[PDB]
Amino acid sequence: FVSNSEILKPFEKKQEEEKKQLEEIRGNPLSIGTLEEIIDDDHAIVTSPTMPDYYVSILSFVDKELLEPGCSVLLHHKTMSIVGVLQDDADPMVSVMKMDKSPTESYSDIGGLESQIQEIKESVELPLTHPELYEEMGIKPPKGVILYGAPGTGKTLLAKAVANQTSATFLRIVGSELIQKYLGDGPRLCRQIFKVAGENAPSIVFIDEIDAIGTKRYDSNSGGEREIQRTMLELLNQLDGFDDRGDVKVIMATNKIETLDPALIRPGRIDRKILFENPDLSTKKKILGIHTSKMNLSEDVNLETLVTTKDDLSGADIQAMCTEAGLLALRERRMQVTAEDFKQAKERVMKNKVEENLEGLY
Template sequence: MTPKKDPETNPWMKTALVWFGIFAAIILFVSVFDGSKQRVTGDSIAYSDFLSRVDNGQVRDVAIGDDVVSGTLTDDTAFRTAAPNDPRLIDRLTEKNVKFSARPRDEPSFWMILLYQSLPFLLLVGLAFFVLRQMQKNSGSGAMGFGKSKAKMLTEKHGRVTFDDVAGIDESREELQEIVDFLKDPSKFARLGGKIPKGALLVGSPGTGKTLLARAVAGEAGVPFFTISGSDFVEMFVGVGASRVRDMFEQAKKNAPCIVFIDEIDAVGRHRGAGLGNGNDEREQTLNQLLVEMDGFEANEGIIIIAATNRPDVLDPALLRPGRFDRQVVVPRPDIEGREKILAVHSKKLPLAPDVDIRTVARGTPGFSGADLANLCNEAALMAARKGKRLVAMREFEEAKDKVMMGAERKSMVMTEDEKKATAYHEAGHALVSLHVPGCDPLHKVTIIPRGRALGVTWNLPERDRYSMSMKQMKARLALCFGGRIAEQLIYGKDSLNTGASNDIQQATDMARSMVMEYGMSEKLGWLRYRDNQDEVFLGHSVARSQTTSEATAQLIDSEVRALIEEAEATARGVLTDNLHELHRLAEALLEYETLTGDESKRAIAGEDIGRSDGDKHRPAPMSSGGSSIPKTRRPKGPFGDPAPAGA
């Protein structure tokens, strides 16, 4: 049998009772003040009619009050009328032998007077109490409870998460398994004198599953799980954040053993002394209190702090020392095995077609985080639903991958034939350079269909997950950046160049400057670092710290960067000049088919039929699983997608 809900625990019932009480009080107030009028009964008649009836002898008796005259007619009919100040009324009643009496004035009792005077005050108090309760419910800490913690306690009824729901980050999960074992059986470690780490800092890029991993630890251990954001501690009032930290640990002590998860801890744990507060500002006081609570004179046994951030470089060193956050657990982007497991988790709820190969999708998505893979599965399901399909096929996964990486197709964008032809030669130049320059990633797809902010996209994908790049590969990518601009120059001349290669030039410049200043790939400058990407936060602005370089060194850096750019331009120009006939063939194929895969591009260059039927003329063939992968950035840059010219 379903238990009845207690009105105290039902917010709707509590609100209804409050409003019912206010309404009843108003009704009582009106009835009390209007009660004197309701006691005078009878039909209401005009005063002139009353006088005429008195003169005609039709009135038997009369009761005269302050403002109402009531009585009975000879036919036993009760009446009442308004009583103006008429001094002749008594004489007329006496003359006609009408019995009359004076109705005494209603004197309110002591309790009635008390009710009259207290009822407005009670209504104001009740309304104020109701408003304060509503503010307490909305703020979670009361109207005046600024110092109360905003940490929320999650239990199994909110959805239990275990390690079975976390895939692709096995190493990170194993590091946290020891915390789970301690929470389940603390005596196992205490017998040998071991102490469990008081805190674990989860470090990783956005979307890699840090929060999910923390919830899985709580779900596996079966202990209370408090969650709070780092920004919830900081308020405009100095001292509020420190008070909330104290209150949070007090709640945690009452529920120990438990886990306290602080998301985005860099909001409150940044380096101290970076501003002008001299240690007295709100954020630094909050951080100081957090440091004391984690490892101070009073031990907090049974409370494990798990925090997450994607900026560990800005955290205060005192927060990272042993005794507070003893462990830094790196949550990386998953490799191909991890991506396959993550896709298997997210695709359980999808009705998959027989042609869907999760391994193939995983091979084609290096650099994707867990959140990216979940979004990929969701986009594939939405595309299948829009087409009216009952199953999600492999084609939907491929189209979803293109949409996630390059943006949606801009089908409504109308391009002239000249613009379309220029885009075809631009993308063909990128593709041709990638096919002829050693060190370039394999060509995966080239299209002149506008996507996102790009008029066309050339997609080069590494053969496997890449964690570093050699100097040969970087020089090949520099040449790839200039393939589109040089192809337009060879076909249309220098005077017809447009702004479509601005992103290519920006990417090439940044890469060449990094090669010279950061990677030590210049013989003249040697293995020295001339740029530091670490930042300090000062008054809300990011101030880059760089080593002081002389004017001569700066000139040498510029000359070395220019040398790399000119070498890349020469390489791309030589490839396109020697293979100009292949450039024309590939551009013509793009104008006809709009989208080509890597294998189709090679057949088009060789003058062969790409193997499409008339019905699939503008539809690319399904992508193969071998060597399919994507860059680590979700949106393509440079040779992977050229932005539209200004005003396009």
């Protein structure tokens, strides 16, 4: 009664009076611009997309700590005054492309790497989710891990399941998008990726399939020989040009890290080397059982037979035989897939592309 009349009543009345004063500031004569520089005199020069020049003062609700060069502030049409700081107009429009919040992945499909899975967890999942581990002991957690191995081992799926446990934004980078040839432009795009990761501080940085130009391998976007120097050394200048104790963790992954520049490896940031291998026959039943959980199997079909037949195959090859055997019975409109479809699937998918060494016995 007494407190509610002296608090709630003047609060709702003051908020309505502040909006009335915005008619001379945020009212219809309103425009925007691009901030250039700020001076200690409470004045700045801002250029709108129509390329004018406006030198005015700074209004309320905003300080100079939030005003940075290159951003977009808010202007006025008549008085031309700077209102306040705002985010990127229309936004960069980067929401989910290489980045997301909580991807859906488990440890069953990546099974078989458990020997090397405990290495990435303790160096990434443990320090990020449990920061008290390295703080109480005073040790420095690994600031990055390198990924090397044959494809099909779930290289992307390895860090995908870790991102769901950390409950943080998981960044990715395509190797071919940084080397795009417009004019130069190679190092310019690299800075914009790490700049966004510094504002919100997701504390997760990952790169999938590092390629650049080893030799050629491109047509539309080439870059020449000068692109190799300005690209591969730009990723080095991120860790070498800045010292970040506990936040940015850079993780690099590709098919072959040997041909890469030893300077690009940046020793001392990545203290862990993880090797990828194909899963053994013991872990194939976990992946096969998931895809066949919704599949109708006949009485003569045994799961232990398909696992024994598989020799030197990736994780995608387990679901490939289930897809091929499922389409054979789908064309004939059968409920339970016959054992003949499973036999023809495991034999065909085994040898398709390269049947023979083409020369000698090797």
